[PDB]
Write a protein that binds this ligand. Structure first.
Ligand SMILES: [K+]
Ligand SMILES: [K+]
Ligand SMILES: [K+]
Lengths: 533, 534, 534
């Protein structure tokens, strides 16, 4: 009655029985290494740049030992919870002959964090000159106080590439944009082996490694507030968002899933209102629809009319494309910062076509509406003519968001008292000299064909992965990535335990926008994030 | 000069000496054949029902290795810092013979946390049928990266029993459901050894497992907002409290200790002034008294008069048929959301008997009080008529929470805007798909002979233990406690690193309250807290 | 068909199996060379000072055999019903070399109780000088009429150290006193064995030793009459209390449980009546509420007015200089000996805010109350102005003891004629030459910013344990607890079968209160409870 995992009554394959002569035939037909071909060669892992800007003692690379240093181990790591052993490395520089400089590789032991000083070269290190063609090979040993590791462990032996002598080029003393791509390739050491099969589907108690929060291409980057594509970055002393922002505990202080979909509600008004209060039909928090905008109007306003724009204290309408070359707008509209949403006003006996929506969160005192810094089921304002008479009308609406009304304003997310929360707004300032960032994209206005900027605290892929998956990161640390544009400009972003992405520079500048991202590793939040801009 | 721990000249007994005939006689009288008997038998651990309603891939049993499995090791563990080795976990099942259905066993390694899914069976598993006669043992090996375990350690090898094939009765209809319960027992195992005997009176430098947070019986459960006994659980999307709510870091965003005792203050009303500001006399935070209640008033109002309520149309209520017969209450009373607080009210020269008080955090402008939910040295309001006439008095006063004047309002702790904090309000939402819970008490009302509900973030025993004892729990896990009522309907509560409690179902319903609570283990927060409601 | 307690088919771990290389590795990492380490070393028990002031025939050390000597046996003893065998009690002394003085050791048999007298040396005794270098062991043999001992057993072989020759310093003058302290350690002994492992959740049918009656620290001491913390002891020739005073038979001549919580009652005053009789709502004895205070008024009087006191000559007191400056007080107040009791005071139609109460056991004749110290269903007095007009009201009321209006009176519990009973007042006098003691609290007063002393027969932890747990103690013995203050001045309290406490000296004096209490053992009541006051 008891059966073991390798136990049963063997009947065979009725028509035939497995032949060894055919399995030996297939080995010679294909060649053969011993059951793991990936243990026999070096595989491309990453490449890093080294310009003339990087002075002596700077660190271009730090990645800790682990199975993420080789793609074939990152694949088979998914079938296990523990590992142990060394990784072999081969690195080279695609330099020129006219280039000098020299570069060093330092396997620092566990525990230590390095410092950008030439004192780290008072320790065994592999010199590599830019003029050197043949690559160089060396091992990264597993020096561990334990007997095995876990996939989340990042206190392992680590490698750093450090500038030993500055790179030189007598030519470009005007552009200073020289090259020397520095590739790193990896092979498993013979002492490498995985331990402890995990059951499939089972989660890891100590979590996984945050190596998939940002995609590897900017074509996939979209905002957590508006669905458009990211176009550039913004650095500010404070960065805050609640709606689709998720921390590493799968917790959001907002009210919406990491999706963009229509918003279904149910208005109910009478006597001629045009300014009703909806109620949720699809939600995660009771009262607020899933996907309701996280921004409030500037002031108290009584929506009754139509658009109205004018320039610097001039009473001159921007009827034409002379909108540009104005630099200040009054925006005299009675609807002055709402969100435009196409509606399907379904009702019994309306017998008239639907109308646009002009939604926001606010307190309905009367026909007017007051800015509500906080959201609630008693704050969900909608300004559209549902064609109401004296008797009640309980239409179904099913909005979808298209644009914005606040012409001539700052980017959505600059002002804080207009940005919506439930109770507590997440917020982060500078954390060890590193500055937080927004992700900037655009949203269409309602009157002028131009668009307005929008600030985002995350990329939606970063929110979807933090809503679903379980990662490890200590609070005093980042999950650091490296952004590289089509040119040789790069900078490291750092995503904290709260979900906010930081940057070490004060200004990124413009960048050729087909970008890529690679996971470097876990860093402390104190040490400034590397850059070359 | 030097003497070892076993060294000294023996003289013995002076009138007699120890005998072996008498020690042998005690082994005759007893059945003493070997010491450490718990190593020689299996001891009860628990028992699970396996019904036909339970589809495949469901987990029935799940325990991690450790000395909390067997009670005889849980006892000796108090003397040692460390342990190591394997436990043997016997399983017994008594099927009907005509039944069918196989049941799997998986010893998942350390570092994982199982899930209810057949993917767990894509892994080595032993099976045993309902027609299994003899018990099966399933030694759990100690797989460890360290050389010994501590007692605070919980990432250990675990064993799960889960339904491989559904249980089958050929006679039973599709409607009626049957079952066979599976019993679980444990024994220390041969390689099990404790390590590093500790001296008594020794702080253990990491604590122990969170096994003593919820008492094992409901008679000992009282809230952290009001002192009365719990009566039911309340699931809400957001849960929040500051005063007596403590986390695993022994730190609090509140102002009071986990104990209910009177509130001594002093108040120095000057002129004819039935209200004034009181100053702390006993405190852990400067300015705020210890035991001061964490709820404000709804509105700005002047306490001057008597009680008043109406049945939605001005019909005043003066009888139980009106109060219970009402659907809602207006409560036009002028001292609405406060606490009665008997108030001894001593002073020098105040020969008049004392008068009850009404307290909240609120500002004061010369007659009134406004709702201010940020407590300070100046947000300590009192209204008790300390017989003042045109002269500073400086009375001393001691106050004991009795009731709550806010008739008709919702349950206390249901509105953050009215709940009091210093700077930061601890608050949670649904971690995983597990909903938070308040613990429900009731508190007395003013002149009505009914009561009003009261919500609580913790049980006071949970707060008390987290103020004194040090525990490890990462911010991704829960300390799980299986609740079992009198009928056998059960569910698992999971306590947070933040101190809040959770439950893995949208509604618990009603249930017998002479109920219990047993620590099952540490559990990751994503995984839905198990339950069986009926 | 049948399966023994160690029987079942083993399959083991399915992914791995137990290893010995890893269990060996934990013994390498640790110092594990043998299990049950407490059998291999001597553990600290206590230490005594031997000074030159101490004449011959004085007893310094006295312990009976048992597992409460060593803490590692006191722990395992919780798993077993019985024990047997000998303990080894090491002694260490470090004299100056120039000292002289011999010290005796006597293992007195079971059935006796020693005395401080040289007649004890007319018996086999071993001696050891101040110049003793190495420790001495002195195994205590288990002489027993039974075949095994239980844990409740205390008539066991004992060992006493006593001064055979006074300690001598040739340099020290007759005035100055020196000393050498003797340290005592214990080890389980070779023939020691526990017996009859008990299943958990098992009542032990005789209990255990009275080792947990007084807590080990003074921060946890509160009286059985008022909830406040103790501050000093009070020796009186007679001691008496009924309400929360419990004996070792789990029986009481009182009416309340050992816990302080509010007092819910109902009162049905008819006409304009500021006083009436309340009826129990929560009770263990029919008629009397649980928590009702056990003290009467001094005199017949009508509660109608305000407070009033005078300084022996009509000079009213309205300031601290007058109260403290006074020698005695008249207290012409009309509501003298009662308790303030905040009184929520709800009812249907009583919109007026509540008013404090004044309670005692007393009769009532239409305006007044007379002191009746026999509590009944009709001796439940209240004076709180429940806004009654010419109509029965039947208010519900909850009351919480705050203070005591009897300004100027002596300490509460000092007059039997005022202390309340049902039928029988428990009472003791001087057993042996050991004087009883009250435990002293203080209770708040009415409008004075001072307090008044309060006497207590027990600590509430002592009452609580004697209500729930079953203990053996004959009516001739005491359960002894050695009190030690911060300076080292000590004395022994002995608790009675009746529940009362005693002390072996006429006056204790003043002493540091961060003090402790340790159980020394059972002691016959004739023998004077030892002490060392300084
Ligand atoms: K329509
Ligand atoms: K007074
Ligand atoms: K009342």
């Amino acid at each position: 009655s008891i059966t073991a995992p390798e136990q049963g009554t063997p009947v065979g394959g009725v028509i035939a029985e497995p032949s060894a002569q055919m399995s030996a035939a297939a080995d010679m037909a294909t060649g053969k290494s011993v059951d793991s071909e990936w243990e026999a060669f070096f595989s491309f892992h990453t490449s890093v740049n080294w310009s003339t800007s990087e002075t002596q003692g700077k660190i271009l690379f730090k990645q800790s030992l682990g199975p993420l240093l080789n793609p074939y181990l990152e694949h088979l790591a998914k079938l296990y919870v523990a590992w142990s052993g060394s990784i072999d490395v081969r690195f080279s520089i695609s330099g020129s002959g006219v280039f000098g400089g020299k570069l060093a590789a330092i396997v620092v032991p566990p525990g230590v964090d390095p410092v950008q000083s030439t004192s780290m070269l008072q320790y065994p290190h592999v010199l590599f000159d830019a003029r050197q063609v043949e690559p160089v090979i060396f091992s990264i040993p597993d020096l561990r106080s334990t007997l095995y590791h876990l996939m989340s462990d990042t206190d392992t032996t680590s490698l750093v590439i450090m500038v030993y002598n500055d790179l030189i080029n007598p030519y470009a003393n005007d552009s200073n944009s020289s090259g020397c791509i520095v590739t790193v390739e990896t092979k498993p050491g013979a002492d490498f082996k995985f331990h402890l099969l995990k059951p499939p589907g089972s989660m890891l108690t100590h979590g996984s490694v945050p190596s998939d929060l940002i995609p590897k291409s900017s074509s996939l980057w979209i905002g957590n507030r508006h669905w458009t594509d990211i176009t550039d970055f913004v650095i500010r002393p404070f960065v805050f968002q609640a709606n689709r922002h998720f921390d590493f505990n799968q917790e959001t202080a907002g009210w919406s899933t990491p999706r963009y979909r229509p918003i279904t509600i149910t208005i109910s008004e009478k006597n001629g209102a045009k300014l009703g209060i909806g109620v949720a039909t699809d939600y995660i928090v009771p009262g607020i629809p899933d996907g309701w905008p996280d921004t409030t109007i500037p002031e108290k306003l009584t929506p009754a009319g139509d658009y109205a724009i004018t320039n610097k204290s001039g009473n001159d309408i921007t009827t034409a494309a002379g909108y540009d070359g104005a630099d200040v707008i009054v925006n005299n509209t009675n609807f002055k910062g709402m969100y435009i949403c196409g509606s399907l006003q379904r009702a019994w006996g309306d017998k008239k076509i639907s109308n646009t929506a002009f939604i926001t969160t606010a307190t309905k005192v009367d026909n007017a509406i007051e800015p509500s810094n906080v959201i609630d089921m008693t704050k969900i304002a909608v300004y559209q003519d549902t064609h109401v008479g004296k008797e009640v009308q309980t239409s179904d609406d099913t909005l979808s968001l298209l644009g914005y009304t606040g012409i001539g304003e700052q980017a959505i997310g600059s002002d804080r008292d207009r940005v919506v929360r439930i109770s507590v707004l997440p917020e982060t300032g500078a954390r060890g000299g590193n500055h937080p960032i927004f992700y900037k994209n655009s949203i269409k206005l309602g009157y002028v064909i131009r668009s307005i900027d929008v600030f985002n605290s995350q990329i939606l892929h970063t929110s979807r992965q933090l809503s679903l998956n379980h990662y490890l990161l200590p609070p005093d640390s980042f999950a650091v990535y490296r952004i590289i544009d089509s040119n040789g400009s790069w900078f490291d972003i750092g995503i904290d335990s709260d979900g906010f992405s930081f940057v070490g520079v004060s200004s990124i500048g413009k960048l050729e926008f087909p970008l890529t991202a690679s996971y470097m590793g876990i860093q402390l939040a104190k040490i400034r994030l590397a850059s070359n801009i």
